[PDB]
Symmetry: C2
Subunit: 271 residues, 2 copies
């Protein structure tokens, strides 16, 4: 039950120029995380430089995240997105990350029910091509359940349908995203347990399926029940990381410090 | 010469729910008295022949085709394929008799740092320098849109002007509401960018998308928020604007009701000016 910090949680301070990647790694080390989950949106940095940062701060990468359009209808774009996915897997090898998580589509690019219907077999086809490459390199490939309901990978049923058609594919469960999809987060974990190798933890306070809008909350101040998840995870001997995600407006370092105090308290009660 | 168009994006909620298809949006636009639709194109699955058939049935035209394309892609092969995709969108404009294309040239989730923003900008410009001559060769006006996610280097007046002045022939779709998000005065944006503006998106915001100036904003029915459309209309009429004014709505009210309610306000304000 080790914790990892998503670099994506610090995006506000990276966008403002207050933190660079090394600062995020250093901050994760100082806050006691065992790893970072690295969002990779370009290959501008050399692997050498990232490996150096990780050695300096005695940090590891639990998972590399990327947004890739595996729903692309246009053949040449679709093929280049598979190639990009392979390049991300290559980066996981270079950086000693055991896992990749793909968000396999973009919400602004699904503009109708017919688009959603067509996107699903396309995503599945892409993942059947990419997952064997990940396996050959010794990398565990996952998708994430998402929060924009026009993407055909949000509900328990949707993610299960993909997982059951892609040999070897695994799941990063975003516990809070299930709430947006109208699912019970704990039920999602129970139904998808055999595929869940990574988890994102984020909270919401009171657009959903159940028709009620949510705001990002500091962990423990919203509606998500983390202790119940941790209890089941310990019971089931989950061996992946618990990744800290925050998408709100509180200063990102403060959000991590405050939310981690709640999460560690809840885990310690279960242990 | 002030004409209204309906963004198909404004109807996306009912398209996603299966309540409306593209033809329904075209027919709705015709029934509500629009001069055109602005078509969001996210794939080429629709037959060009069938779109043209729909436009003829409903006596409608397409004023502009909108697309999201990642012209900031750092990996060369992806970058080149996104230039080719943009050229294929221009070809679709020819096939559909749309005079204009609007690209949103990057994706907010793919710019994760200030350095990423810095590196994206010359990349986007270089792509647009390749795409714009192709649009010109096909008689298509190419535009970008000023956006609302401030990590993208195309939101402020200064950012959009920097791109436009480096890409010969490039023009602008002014999203008047997005300028408010960027901390600009929407009317001053129009005045400073007037010679480039060939299309406009009209949307409104109410004070409850995070602004530069602090205020929290949510989509508003037009006329119920803070955007002054009459002042814009008065200036465009004064300058003999010949383009379209495109109706954009991003909120939660039923999309057909939002068009009916918002257009009543917009037409009233334009009428007070002419
Ligand atoms: Mn997540
Ligand atoms: Mn717009």
């Amino acid at each position: 039950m080790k914790f990892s910090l998503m670099t994506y949680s610090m995006v506000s301070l990276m966008r403002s120029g207050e933190m660079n990647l090394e600062d995020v790694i250093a901050f994760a080390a100082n806050e006691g995380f065992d790893a970072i989950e690295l969002l990779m949106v370009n290959f501008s940095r050399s692997s050498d430089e990232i490996r150096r940062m990780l050695e300096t701060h005695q940090m590891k990468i639990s998972c590399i995240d990327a947004f890739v359009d595996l729903a692309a209808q246009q053949e040449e774009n679709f093929l280049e997105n598979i190639s990009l996915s392979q390049r991300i897997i290559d980066q996981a090898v270079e950086l000693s990350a055991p896992m990749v998580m793909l968000v396999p589509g973009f919400p602004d690019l699904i503009a109708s029910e017919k688009d959603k219907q067509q996107a699903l077999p396309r995503i599945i086809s892409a993942l059947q091509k990419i997952t064997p490459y990940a396996q050959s390199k010794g990398i565990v490939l996952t998708i994430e359940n998402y929060s924009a309901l026009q993407m055909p990978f949000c509900s328990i049923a949707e993610v299960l349908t993909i997982l059951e058609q892609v040999p070897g594919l695994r799941l990063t469960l975003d516990y809070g995203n299930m709430l947006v999809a109208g699912e019970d987060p704990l039920e999602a974990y129970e139904k998808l347990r055999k595929y869940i190798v990574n988890a994102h933890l984020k909270d919401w306070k009171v657009r959903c399926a159940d028709g009620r809008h949510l705001e990002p909350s500091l962990h423990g101040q919203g509606v998500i029940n983390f202790k119940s998840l941790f209890a089941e995870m310990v019971s089931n001997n989950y061996k992946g990381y618990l990744s800290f995600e925050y998408e709100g407006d509180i200063n990102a370092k403060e959000a991590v410090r405050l939310g981690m105090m709640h999460l560690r308290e809840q885990l310690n009660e279960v242990i």
